[PDB]
Design a protein around this ligand. Sequence first.
Ligand SMILES: [Mg+2]
Length: 182
Amino acid sequence: LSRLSFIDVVNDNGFYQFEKPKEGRKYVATLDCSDYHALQIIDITEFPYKQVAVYHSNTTSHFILPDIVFKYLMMYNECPVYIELNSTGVSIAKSLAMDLEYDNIICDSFIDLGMKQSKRSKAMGCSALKDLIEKDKLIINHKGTIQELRTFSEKFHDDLVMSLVIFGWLTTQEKFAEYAGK
Ligand SMILES: [Mg+2]
């Protein structure tokens, strides 16, 4: 843990940015919705991964969120998004697809537009995260995230960590191959 430091970037209206988009780099975004909404944008290129932007808020209406997500996803090279399918993720993921006609959505199946909930995935995901940070394979820069990585037990908020767990689960998958690499 505690070898973790953060860059104290200003909270630009919910959106935290540590690196702006650089052509040639391939990003990936995971979302845990409405507790705050937490949008993690990671750089999966060089197997040094980097958390370049974070969207954090417990005050945006899930009604308008897709617009917010859309903005940042487009901003980072038509970025792929992996939405956890809780009661709200389902609606958000649909808007993102129908309403905003965004096509770079990662799906679990044609019916589930993101990560389908399961005790199995969360667990499996946590583990995958634990070995991404500890091996210094995932570089975190956000203050909140780091604070939650200090009040989140193996078994108070955790949205920013959950968000990074969606990312874990996404790394235990095969499809992750393509999206990866510059
Ligand atoms: Mg949440």
